[PDB]
Amino acid sequence: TIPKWWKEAVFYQVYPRSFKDTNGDGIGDINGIIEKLDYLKALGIDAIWINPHYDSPNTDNGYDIRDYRKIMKEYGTMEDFDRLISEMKKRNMRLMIDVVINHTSDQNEWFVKSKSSKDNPYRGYYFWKDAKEGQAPNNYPSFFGGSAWQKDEKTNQYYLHYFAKQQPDLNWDNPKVRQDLYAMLRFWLDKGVSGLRFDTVATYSKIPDFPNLTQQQLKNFAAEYTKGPNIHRYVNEMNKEVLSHYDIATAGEIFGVPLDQSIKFFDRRRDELNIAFTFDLIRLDRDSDQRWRRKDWKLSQFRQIIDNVDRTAGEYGWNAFFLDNHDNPRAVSHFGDDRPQWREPSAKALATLTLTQRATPFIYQGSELGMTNYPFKAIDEFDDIEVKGFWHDYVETGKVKADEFLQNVRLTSRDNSRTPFQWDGSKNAGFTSGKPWFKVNPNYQEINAVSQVTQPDSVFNYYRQLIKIRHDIPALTYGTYTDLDPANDSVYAYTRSLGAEKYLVVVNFKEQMMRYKLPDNLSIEKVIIDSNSKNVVKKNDSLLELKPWQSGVYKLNQ
């Protein structure tokens, strides 16, 4: 085990668009982030990861980049960006930015030139192909709807886009492309950014000759897209030519990658990436074919995935741990219980799990307040292009009924985590003086930052306490992870141990009071923290009485 600031750091993810608006146009901006750095510092955050801040038409809210060297108009200036880095440095905070290089906006200069003629120098920066019998080159489907091939009538060829048609994929097989991307990365790294989070990092390498996908592959095509024969050669090349020249932390969003193949991206000996962002846990209850649909799950399934993810990282890799982010529903709604009676306690329980895993924890803006999913009714209330893609492919084709579709996307939509951060009880929760780009959840009157910061028993302050505890206990970062019983669907319990120091974490996922006898003659030395109190725990206790959703951390004897 080697110590790294990024293994011990508590990260906080900021979705600029919905964090804090400072000029009344309804859109979060960089000055808003700077304005809240003291709030985050009080919380105890060590580093901030911000979603795409580059010039973009926003077909995919920042993930379709028109100019990699320019700040998105709505977010501010290069000046604001440099100030953010500086104000953060002052507070001993490190900044991580989002690197979106699997594709670019179709308004990106390289693509504008690329589509102009078959002989343009930049034609090879993307993937162009002739029709096949007047049809698309092959049967590749797009994550965002319809075919992954878009016809261009000027040149009579189709271009590839795994995501939106406004997001053409870059030709990593072209050396000039890699070199230009490396140059772009150095531009941002030389400004002092401390980390890079790579968006869909495992799809850079395409399949030679683009052969059709089998009928079966069509039901799980992301898995086929991550089989590029040169993905690791490329990630490692990027490490040698760029990454290795700076003291930074790199996270890889390995979308589509099976857990067994994940280690090749993060084994420290391979010189590729540092922190793994896996989907196994966060989308454990998601259908792999109809990717918008959810199904029931049990704690035993949840904890069994955590154990597999932990063992796969093992000795040479490293994991990030999070239960929500901008591409998923809210943690308290998804993994806890967001009803009025259980929201705060279940929220605190997820907080406990999050800050005590053998991994870098990532907290998503607003989840430290227990923000919940938004009550979307009609299909036109969603903003997400992904949602619209699913709606077209599944509802407008008559494959699935609108009501059943909506029942599911209300539970799985990325938009659930994109409603404006709830700062206070004023109009629009204090997010903006204008009109929010996306509607604010009505529950902000009950759930807001100003209210919780001064309340010692608040969700915000529970996170603050847990972040302090993790900072104070090496075992909680580096301690080995052991699940006391992977088949238990009621009480989640595990130990974290480093040398002679051993700690226990427990969460009663049940709505009923539970008595839990510890195994292996384990006994309690002292309570580190617990959501309860009045639930007296004494030295040498080996039986815990847990109230519904109760949770806690204890130091064990020996």
Q: How many independent structural domains does the chain possess?
A: 3
Do residue 427 and residue 543 come from a single domain?
A: no
Cα–Cα distance between 279 and 102 in angstroms, integer?
Answer: 18
On whether the CB atoms of residues 206 and 228 are closer than 8 A, the answer is yes
The amino acid at 157 = Q
Do residue 87 and residue 192 come from a single domain?
A: yes
Give, for 247, the enclosing helix (H) or strand (E).
none
Which residues 6+ apart lie within 8 Å of 476 measured at CB? 355, 356, 469, 470, 496, 503
Domain interval for residue 534: 480-558
Cα–Cα distance between 420 and 411 in angstroms, integer?
Answer: 18
For the chain, the 3-state helix, strand and coil shares in percent, each to the nearest 5, are 35, 20, 50
On whether the CB atoms of residues 68 and 54 are closer than 8 A, the answer is yes
Do residue 135 and residue 240 come from a single domain?
A: no
Inter-axis angle of helices 231-241 and 175-189, nearest 10: 40
Inter-axis angle of helices 259-266 and 299-313, nearest 10: 40
Quick one: tokens of 170? 């870059």
On whether the CB atoms of residues 131 and 137 are closer than 8 A, the answer is yes
What's the angle, vertex CA 77, arms to CA 168 and CA 21, rounded to 5? Answer: 90
Quick one: tokens of 420? 């404006």
The closest alpha carbon to 263, from 313, 220, 200, belongs to 313
Q: Please state the φ and ψ torsions of residue 304, each to the nearest 5 degrees.
A: -65, -30
Do residue 75 and residue 142 come from a single domain?
A: no
Which residues 6+ apart lie within 8 Å of 417 measured at CB? 15, 324, 325, 326, 327, 328, 329, 330, 364, 366
Do residue 253 and residue 168 come from a single domain?
A: no
Do residue 59 and residue 158 come from a single domain?
A: no
Give me the CATH number covering residue 161: 3.90.400.10
Domain limit, last residue, from 174, 190, 220: 174
Do residue 179 and residue 310 come from a single domain?
A: yes
Do residue 97 and residue 242 come from a single domain?
A: yes
Q: Please state the φ and ψ torsions of residue 193, each to the nearest 5 degrees.
A: -70, 145
In what order do the strands lie in the sheet containing 360-364? 275-277, 249-253, 195-198, 94-99, 47-50, 11-14, 360-364, 320-321
Give, for 100, the enclosing helix (H) or strand (E).
none
Give me the CATH number covering residue 485: 2.60.40.1180
DSSP single-letter state for residue 274: S
The amino acid at 131 = A
**555: β partners:** 503, 526
Domain limit, last residue, from 479, 505, 529: 479
Domain limit, last residue, from 174, 199, 223: 174
Q: Please state the φ and ψ torsions of residue 13, each to the nearest 5 degrees.
A: -95, 125
The amino acid at 545 = E
**159: β partners:** 128, 150
Do residue 411 and residue 310 come from a single domain?
A: yes
DSSP single-letter state for residue 319: B
Resolution number, Å: 2.0
Residues marked active site are found at 199, 253
Q: What approach was used to elucidate this structure?
A: X-ray
Do residue 161 and residue 86 come from a single domain?
A: no
CA distances from 293 to 286, 287, 399, 406 (A): 6, 6, 13, 10
Do residue 341 and residue 368 come from a single domain?
A: yes
Do residue 470 and residue 516 come from a single domain?
A: no
What's the angle, vertex CA 367, arms to CA 40 and CA 164, rounded to 5? Answer: 105
Cα–Cα distance between 272 and 230 in angstroms, integer?
Answer: 13
**Which DSSP string do the residues of 49-97 spell out, in sequence order?**
EE---EE---TTTTSS-SEEEEE-GGG--HHHHHHHHHHHHHTT-EEEE
